[PDB]
Design a binder for this molecule. Sequence first.
Ligand SMILES: Nc1nc2c(ncn2[C@@H]2O[C@H](COP(=O)(O)OP(=O)(O)O)[C@@H](O)[C@H]2O)c(=O)[nH]1
Ligand SMILES: Nc1nc2c(ncn2[C@@H]2O[C@H](COP(=O)(O)OP(=O)(O)O)[C@@H](O)[C@H]2O)c(=O)[nH]1
Ligand SMILES: O=P(O)(O)OC[C@H]1O[C@@H](n2cnc3c(OP(=O)(O)O)ncnc32)C[C@@H]1O
Ligand SMILES: O=P(O)(O)OC[C@H]1O[C@@H](n2cnc3c(OP(=O)(O)O)ncnc32)C[C@@H]1O
Ligand SMILES: [Mg+2]
Ligand SMILES: [Mg+2]
Lengths: 431, 431
Amino acid sequence: AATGSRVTVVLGAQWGDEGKGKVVDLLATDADIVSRCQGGNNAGHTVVVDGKEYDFHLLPSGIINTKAVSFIGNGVVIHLPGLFEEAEKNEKKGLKDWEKRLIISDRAHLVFDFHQAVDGLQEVQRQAQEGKNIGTTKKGIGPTYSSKAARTGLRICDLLSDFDEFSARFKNLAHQHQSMFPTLEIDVEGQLKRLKGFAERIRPMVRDGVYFMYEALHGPPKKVLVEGANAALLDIDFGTYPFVTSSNCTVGGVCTGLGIPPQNIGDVYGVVKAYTTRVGIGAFPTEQINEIGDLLQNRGHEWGVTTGRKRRCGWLDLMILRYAHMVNGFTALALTKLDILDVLSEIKVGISYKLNGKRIPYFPANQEILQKVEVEYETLPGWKADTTGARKWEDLPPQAQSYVRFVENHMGVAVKWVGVGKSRESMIQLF
Amino acid sequence: AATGSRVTVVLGAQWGDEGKGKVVDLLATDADIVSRCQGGNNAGHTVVVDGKEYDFHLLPSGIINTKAVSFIGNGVVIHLPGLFEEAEKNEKKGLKDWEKRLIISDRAHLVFDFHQAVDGLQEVQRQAQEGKNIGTTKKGIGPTYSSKAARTGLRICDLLSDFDEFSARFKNLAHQHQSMFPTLEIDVEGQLKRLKGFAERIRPMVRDGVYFMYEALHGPPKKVLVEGANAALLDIDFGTYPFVTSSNCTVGGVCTGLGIPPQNIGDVYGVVKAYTTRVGIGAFPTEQINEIGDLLQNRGHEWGVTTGRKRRCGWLDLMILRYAHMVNGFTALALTKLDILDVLSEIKVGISYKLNGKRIPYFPANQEILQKVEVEYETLPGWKADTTGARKWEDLPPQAQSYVRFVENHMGVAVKWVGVGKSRESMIQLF
Ligand SMILES: Nc1nc2c(ncn2[C@@H]2O[C@H](COP(=O)(O)OP(=O)(O)O)[C@@H](O)[C@H]2O)c(=O)[nH]1
Ligand SMILES: Nc1nc2c(ncn2[C@@H]2O[C@H](COP(=O)(O)OP(=O)(O)O)[C@@H](O)[C@H]2O)c(=O)[nH]1
Ligand SMILES: O=P(O)(O)OC[C@H]1O[C@@H](n2cnc3c(OP(=O)(O)O)ncnc32)C[C@@H]1O
Ligand SMILES: O=P(O)(O)OC[C@H]1O[C@@H](n2cnc3c(OP(=O)(O)O)ncnc32)C[C@@H]1O
Ligand SMILES: [Mg+2]
Ligand SMILES: [Mg+2]
């Protein structure tokens, strides 16, 4: 009553695609506000309600709940074209009146077309310049955040004020990018013209984000849900740098992205996949490039929704999870895709790393080290049974319950949800 | 006992130079750990203990307490040369054995010489390109953070591993900068050579920051103090963008800068100056370019310690303070430099802003708007008496106590400390 209402947070605990869209969708059913705080459409969150499947990127996953307000915080980077393309793609799937329940923070930054093109150029250069790049989503997230830090970028509020001033600063930002890559095209007037349209198409949804969240956390009690993007080990500060995204996907990102103090943050849920996946380049200790990897990849559908690029798969890894927790302080976990392991006789789990026959004392800041470590595994018996229909703790067979406990025990955090299917109702609440 | 010990935070509530060094120094007397989480030596924190005066920038202000450990978190950007220059400058003032009680996070980023040069180049360009720049400290903070977001920058851990790999990536980062400014010099081998020295000179102090803080917050109880840098309205997200510094000086920055969850954050103190100051370019609603401004400037010594560049001065402004609080959620305040107002018959205080004869509902995200607003002032009687020797609430005269209450009341936060002198003992604890 003194500090106001506290928000619930959902964050990825590994390298992304843990099932944030799913957990958020489940928790948004009775939420008054659902929001994104960092990242851009580099994120891809799948939701399955009824027989309908959605894949949001910029839209909060709660856009589905017509009785709730979806909010895009100041920490997010918005690419207007992608935003609308996404919305329409979903409008055709039944999404209606979204614009009436979507609010955009006027302090959020703009991803411009050249930011996306430059993202691609930087990757091609890194590839032909040293044999390997980052494995970026090519959405210009990195370039946009780079402009944000430089204070050269433009924001939502800039786009809605004097368009002439916006146009001038835009042109400068554009030319500055052609200095980095003189072959970059950039149809200044074309883009500039399209942007003018987006300004008016987006004007009625924009608002002051700070005042909006403050009012909501200190006005009559409200249920505010924060949908994280990307994941812990992809964090610009704490991830396997430089093979990371360019924002803080960890808990701190909720504060800096929505302008809310730590006391207004409550439950922080860590979405943990029963096994590990990585989309781009970089160290992956428990990576399984083999029969096992193909099975996880296959039974798990580990590939990009559009591009269809398959994701690297590997055994569960506790080193990254324990590390993720040290930074995020999860209050509970959502262990997902347990059903994928239904067919295994034995499941291995990475518990620690050894470099020179010696167990590293902690997760390496230098990603290059991880490439050299040897995983120390623990083999666990499989429950070899179909759990896709499990709806209660007791429904799960012995070996499966054991697997859940294994995770809680070695992370020191309790599992509150167990996923056994992509649809909303395919979950089990432990408490 | 479940979440571990909580840290105490000290943040600036205006546009910097509120007296963080002073408040932190006072609170570090019984602290086990004192640390910086964001910023670089763009910060300047003055401390006065006994008859000795210090001005730290990269070193936490608690470096003075030989029985405490000073820690530089992952969110900070370190310029090795400046670090040592600073330390030596203080060694000559009695600072001894600092290196034995200073710990550096291996995930912190490096400010390279060319980052500083580029910072200057970007400012000269902005000046001769459009009549005005940012008023940067010219420490390359912006450029370094720009590289961090791009993932092209190098970190402490990179500098301590394979120097050949570091040298190669360094060269690339350097050339990338000459593409932005082809006239940039850059003595690749020279700097590269100096850096090799710093690596070994700094090796014994570096450690894994995440494990270091986690151990401290969950091991036996400890008193951890976090020294903020810059200030709320200078925040890259919530400040008067683009006339801001390039990191989150607000509360969220503690989490992203030290890798600690919100539940481990406790008391968050807002250092509030009795009047307002701004070092660089940008809107300043209550700015007083006159006799009053000169007096505040004069009695307050509002100028850079080295460069001697005077700071813009103005009346206290509640709009920015209330806004700062919405984002930081201060638990208490430290109202400083009250003694500067000792000689005024009446003191004005900005309470709200009017644009078209109408009171704005909230702090403008667009800094350009602020330039157009008209401040609505409230005049208060001065206590016209010397308070430099006040040590208790009762010591302060009627009008002065009233001024303190005015601040608490219009901010909804209580004042816990009142400053009446730059030295440590020149403070008054209200509770
Ligand atoms: N079989 C199965 N699929 C799941 C489960 N949880 C989530 N999924 C699917 O796993 C995928 C995870 O990808 P994604 O949506 O990118 O996750 P996010 O990025 O964390 O939101 C989605 O296609 C989900 O539908 C589960 O418990 N079982
Ligand atoms: N007279 C007076 N000076 C003060 C008081 N509090 C702080 N100072 C001085 O005000 C100045 C503030 O500048 P600075 O050290 O940059 O503050 P910081 O950046 O917030 O640490 C310092 O020179 C302090 O010594 C006070 O209550 N009275
Ligand atoms: O494009 P980028 O600059 O962020 O790429 C840099 C690296 O970041 C990785 N990436 C970025 N966002 C996500 C993602 O978010 P999700 O779907 O919300 O969980 N899920 C999985 N991988 C992701 C891919 C690159 O290695
Ligand atoms: O150099 P820069 O890029 O950060 O400059 C950008 C703007 O940031 C302002 N600046 C930066 N740091 C500080 C500061 O920190 P302190 O002493 O810890 O309170 N105190 C006062 N002004 C400051 C000056 C520029 O307008
Ligand atoms: Mg995804
Ligand atoms: Mg200062």
